[PDB]
Amino acid sequence: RDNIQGITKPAIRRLARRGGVKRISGLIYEETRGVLKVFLENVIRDAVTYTEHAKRKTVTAMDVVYALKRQGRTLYGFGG
Amino acid sequence: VLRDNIQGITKPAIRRLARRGGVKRISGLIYEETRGVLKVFLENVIRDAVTYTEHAKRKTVTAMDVVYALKRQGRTLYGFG
Amino acid sequence: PHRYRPGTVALREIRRYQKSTELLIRKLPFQRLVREIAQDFKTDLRFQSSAVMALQEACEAYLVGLFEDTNLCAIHAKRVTIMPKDIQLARRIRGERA
Amino acid sequence: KPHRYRPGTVALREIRRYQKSTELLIRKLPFQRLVREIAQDFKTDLRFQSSAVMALQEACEAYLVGLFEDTNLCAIHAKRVTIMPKDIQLARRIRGER
Amino acid sequence: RSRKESYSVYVYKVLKQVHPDTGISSKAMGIMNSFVNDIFERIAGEASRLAHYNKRSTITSREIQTAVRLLLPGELAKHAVSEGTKAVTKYTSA
Amino acid sequence: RSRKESYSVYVYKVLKQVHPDTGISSKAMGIMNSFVNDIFERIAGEASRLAHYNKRSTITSREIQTAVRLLLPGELAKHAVSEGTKAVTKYTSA
Amino acid sequence: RAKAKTRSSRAGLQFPVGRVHRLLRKGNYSERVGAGAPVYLAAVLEYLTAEILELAGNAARDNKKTRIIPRHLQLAIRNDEELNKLLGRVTIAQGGVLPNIQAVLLPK
Amino acid sequence: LAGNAARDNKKTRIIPRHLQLAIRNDEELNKLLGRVTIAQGGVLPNIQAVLLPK
DNA sequence: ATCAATATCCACCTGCAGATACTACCAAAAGTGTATTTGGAAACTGCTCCATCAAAAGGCATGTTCAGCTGGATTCCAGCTGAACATGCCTTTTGATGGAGCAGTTTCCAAATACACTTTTGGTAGTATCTGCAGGTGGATATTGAT
């Protein structure tokens, strides 16, 4: 279950181009995959905590918004 | 009134603060730079502190006002209440 | 045949992707990754579509910010190539590793 | 013919000395005058407790020490041992203060 | 019969005031709702803290004024303070 | 001339439990008071938020448990949860 | 009885004073709430909304469009010092970034 | 943790330095209290490897 | 400077998803009036600690000299990253189906609050008391730098 190679190398290069980067080493891709997986599990842990506290089975957008806000990464647009 | 006291933060004091931070060699242009930084920091806290003091209609700044300002800037401080 | 010099298409892509607002990761792979990660905290969870959309928006914003910081750390050392040690320095200074 | 330590020896010795201790590193009276001057620029005829100025001193010293550590990291990144103002600026920019 | 209150119509009134002939999409309106809610919670939390520090049991106009001063910077703080003061005097004098 | 409550004696009891013959200074005791107050406010604020999200009007043991899980990491969260659960069962069964 | 002229009209505002009063009561912020607190808060909120909307509308009319989208809100926020410093830690969905390339990366 | 630190430095009474040494040396405590300043605490003895001689 | 080849930008067209009105209505949400309580503003006062002074004395800061070592520039080279093609795999759309799980309704019952006494217990002042610890002394130890 390599769903982490779902984040292809051209995708990471696009993300880098948006950040203004002009040249990319060949060892950068594994590093960004690790960073992204860390961030994602950090957020999803608290989202699932918020969910199971309310005795639900469906993760809602508000649970993700709260989990993000508690990390100090407020997100506008999904508050409905 | 009092004016021009940022120079009371002497070069040896900054060198000591840098030694505690692990710094081995220090450029000659650092000192001036550092002073600026420090001033900004203080102005951000004292302002907040004074904003608390005038809210209670007091005239003396207490340690709790400083602790509240530091906390509201995300710099929590243990020891003074 | 016509060939651009190494670096021209790079700045063209930079301008193109800084003028745009789209998402840069494909949606189905990210969805699969999110479900696989959530598989370890609790089994048989369901996700609304807006939940995965929010997760994707947040992740892309995070990564773009990290790449800006990395580019600064690279330029500081008088390079133009970003290397893993630049990412490590940026994250160490932000406090994400420390 | 007189004894002289080579450059960098007393610096490491001072590093150990000042990392082993807990005292304050700025004189009390100059710092107090500075704080009073800034406060007077904010609101006239203020007073201060003693513990208030002590708290301000502790907080400011902690801030500067952390900043110097980040600056050292940025300097070492560039293959140097001498810290220079551009390192302070890079650290304060990555942190998010300027 | 479950409703869902929001600040859509008030944001639309303000927009028609400052830009008489420009419209707004639905996603931008959701962004504006999120913004209003966020700033409201910030100000209200700070005012509650201020009231607790002074052992007061009431939130008044002074708590809101001080919270505004503590939260907004410079230009924003000055103009918001002036606006709110004018509003309160207009309200009481009526 | 009004009294000033604190957690000094309870911290001293805990210390005499884990280290029977070690003492503590006054400044360290002030640090410990600050620590207890800070962590208490963190947990209580998070539990209040949790209660507001679910449109509940009561703070119960589940809110405290979830706040503990959301605030403490790994080892700390596990052991604190076990300790509090044991305390509550010991209390109700008495 | 008389005509029930409300409160937001009394204060000369567009935002609702009664709704803000109810939200201040129910939100568990204090055990009493004054009469001028909702008026003050409504005035401040209306001022901030009008500021950000004027900036966003100028951006939208600059890109030859008639209808504001989240990109215009992001361009308005990030281009102003005090707004960018008030909202420095928020993510706007479908906003993008600011066009900006370092000078050393350009050719020549 | 603080008492173990204090008994390590041949002392019988805990001071703020011992609290700082206990907090900064543990992962989960240092990550719970990562953004607090302890008055009269000092720092952790740590010198980069490149600054050492030879 | 030439120019040939690309990619970008501007004008025009248009079909369509999305903004805009409206009627309805309707639950609900705000405004009016009133009687009651209580929290907060006033006036007074007592004492705490904050600003001022001063004096002496030594510990820290300033300035100067000398040298060493580090940062910065120049050169060269190898290797690693970018640009272009050609496949071919995987994402996307969209159309439909079950179906499980979330949201609204009704009871009704266990749990939390308000109130009144009572015992205790934890906190402060005073006065007291050891005692661990900070500062000093001397000697041994370990490290550095020049041969």
Chains that touch H (3 or more CB pairs under 8 A): B, D, F
Q: Which runs of E-coded beta strand occur in chain C?
A: 46-47
Distance (Å) from the C-alpha of residue A40 to the closest C-alpha of chain G?
16
The resolution, in Å, is: 3.6
Q: Read off φ and ψ for residue G78, nearest 5 degrees.
A: -70, -20
3-state secondary structure H14-37: ECHHHHHHHHHHCHHHHHHCCCEE
Q: Which of B29, G84, F79 is nearest to D89 (CA)?
A: B29
- Sign of the CA dihedral with F40 first, then F46, F48, and F50 last: negative
Domain architecture of chain A: domains with CATH: 1-80 (1.10.20.10)
Give residue A58's region: left, alpha or beta (phi > 0; psi -120 to 50). beta
3-class DSSP assignment, residue B35: helix
The answer to whether the CB of G15 falls within 8 A of the CB of G3 is no
Distance (Å) from the C-alpha of residue H51 to the closest C-alpha of chain F?
34
For tokens 């004027």, what's the residue? G54
Q: Which of D55, H16, H9, B65 is nearest to F32 (CA)?
A: H16
Q: Read off φ and ψ for residue E63, nearest 5 degrees.
A: -60, -40
Query: What does the buried/exposed string (b/e) look like for B14-23 if buried means 16 or more CB atoms within 10 Å of the residue's CB?
Result: bbbbbbbbbb
Give the number of beta-carbon pairs within 8 Å between A and F: 14
- Residue A38 to residues A33, A74, C78, G85, Cα–Cα distance (Å): 9, 18, 30, 28
Task: Return the half-sphere exposure (C-beta side, CA atoms, 13 A cut-off) of residue C28.
Answer: 0
Distance (Å) from the C-alpha of residue D27 to the closest C-alpha of chain B?
8
Q: Which residues contact E22 (CB under 8 A, 6 or more apart)?
A: E15, G57, G60, G61, G66, G67, G68
A75 near G CB under 8 A: yes
Q: How far apart are the first and last CA of chain C?
A: 51
Chains that touch G (3 or more CB pairs under 8 A): A, C, E, F
Contact F66 A46 (CB under 8 A): no
Residue C43: CB atoms within 10 Å:
7
- Residue C78 to residues C14, C69, C75, D95, F34, Cα–Cα distance (Å): 20, 15, 5, 21, 46
Q: What letter would DSSP give residue C19?
A: S
- Residue F36 to residues B45, C4, F42, F72, Cα–Cα distance (Å): 24, 64, 10, 14
CB contacts under 8 A, C 68-87 vs D, are: 69, 72-73, 76-78, 85-86
The encoded tokens of residue B73 equal 């800037």
The encoded tokens of residue E12 equal 């639309």
| Run of H or E residues at F23 | strand F23-24
Q: How far apart are the first and last CA of chain A?
A: 33
For tokens 């020896």, what's the residue? D9
The encoded tokens of residue F18 equal 């884990």
Q: Return contacts of A26-29, CB within 8 angstroms, 24+ apart.
A: A27/C83, A27/C84, A28/C82, A28/C83, A28/C84, A28/C87
The CA distance from E29 to A77, in Å, is: 9
The answer to whether the CB of G71 falls within 8 A of the CB of G94 is yes
Q: Which runs of E-coded beta strand occur in A22-69?
A: 58-59
The CA distance from A57 to B60, in Å, is: 55
- CATH class assigned to D15-98: mainly alpha
What angle, 0 to 180 degrees and rounded to 10, lies between the N-to-C axes of helices E26-53 and G36-62? Answer: 150
The answer to whether the CB of B29 falls within 8 A of the CB of B58 is no
Neighboring chain E residues of B64 at a CB cutoff of 8 Å: 53
- Residue C46 to residues A69, C37, G78, G100, Cα–Cα distance (Å): 22, 13, 36, 40
Largest CA distance in chain E: 49
Closest CA to the C1' of I145: that residue is D5
The answer to whether the CB of C56 falls within 8 A of the CB of C30 is yes
For tokens 């996700």, what's the residue? C47
3-class DSSP assignment, residue F73: coil
The answer to whether the CB of H28 falls within 8 A of the CB of F75 is yes
Contact F38 H36 (CB under 8 A): yes
The encoded tokens of residue F70 equal 């959301």
- Sign of the CA dihedral with C17 first, then C23, C29, and C30 last: positive
The CA distance from G49 to G103, in Å, is: 35
The encoded tokens of residue G26 equal 């129910």
- Sign of the CA dihedral with E46 first, then E48, E49, and E53 last: positive
Neighboring chain G residues of A74 at a CB cutoff of 8 Å: 89-91
Contact D16 H45 (CB under 8 A): yes
The CA distance from C90 to C69, in Å, is: 6
The answer to whether the CB of C80 falls within 8 A of the CB of G102 is no
The answer to whether the CB of F76 falls within 8 A of the CB of H32 is yes
- Sign of the CA dihedral with E31 first, then E32, E38, and E41 last: negative
Q: What letter would DSSP give residue D23?
A: S
Residue C13: CB atoms within 10 Å:
16
Q: Is E94 exposed, middle or buried (0-12, 13-18, 19+ CB in 10 A)?
A: exposed
The answer to whether the CB of E48 falls within 8 A of the CB of G30 is yes
Largest CA distance in chain C: 57
Q: Which residues contact G20 (CB under 8 A, 6 or more apart)?
A: E40, G38, G41, G42, G45
The encoded tokens of residue E58 equal 């009431």
The answer to whether the CB of F27 falls within 8 A of the CB of B79 is yes
- Residue D50 to residues B62, B63, D56, F31, Cα–Cα distance (Å): 8, 8, 10, 18
The CA distance from H44 to E46, in Å, is: 35
The CA distance from H38 to H36, in Å, is: 7
- Residue E46 to residues D42, F46, G37, Cα–Cα distance (Å): 22, 16, 13
| Size of chain H, expressed as the number of residues it contains | 54
**Second CATH level (architecture) for the domain G1-106:** Orthogonal Bundle (1.10)
Helices (H) and strands (E) in chain F, counts: 4, 1
Neighboring chain C residues of D88 at a CB cutoff of 8 Å: none
Residue in chain F lying closest to B67 (CA): F34
Domain architecture of chain F: domains with CATH: 1-94 (1.10.20.10)
Experimental method: cryo-EM
The answer to whether the CB of D55 falls within 8 A of the CB of B77 is yes
Q: Which nucleotides of I are covered by protein (CB under 7 A)?
A: 5-8, 18-20, 27-33, 39-41, 49-51, 60-62, 68-72, 80-85, 90-92, 100-105, 112, 122-125, 132-134, 144-146
- Residue H5 to residues A32, B20, D16, F26, H21, Cα–Cα distance (Å): 39, 21, 19, 18, 7
The CA distance from A37 to G33, in Å, is: 46
Q: Which residues contact F72 (CB under 8 A, 6 or more apart)?
A: F80, H28, H32
The answer to whether the CB of H39 falls within 8 A of the CB of H17 is no
The CA distance from B77 to H36, in Å, is: 6
Return the ∠ at Cα C84 (arms to A5 and C18), rounded to 5°.
75
- Residue H31 to residues B52, F46, F72, G81, Cα–Cα distance (Å): 30, 18, 9, 33
Query: What does the buried/exposed string (b/e) look like for A46-65 if buried means 16 or more CB atoms within 10 Å of the residue's CB?
Result: bbbbbbbbeeeeebbbbbbb
From the list F18, F73, F76, which residue is nearest H3 (CB)? F18
Q: What is the CATH number of domain C14-97?
A: 1.10.20.10
Return the ∠ at Cα A36 (arms to A34 and A41), rounded to 5°.
100
Residue F83: CB atoms within 10 Å:
11
Q: What letter would DSSP give residue D5?
A: P
3-class DSSP assignment, residue D32: helix
Neighboring chain F residues of H2 at a CB cutoff of 8 Å: 28
Task: Return the half-sphere exposure (C-beta side, CA atoms, 13 A cut-off) of residue C62.
Answer: 25
The answer to whether the CB of D66 falls within 8 A of the CB of D35 is no
For residue H19, give the amino acid letter: L
Distance in angstroms: CA A10, C1' I84: 16
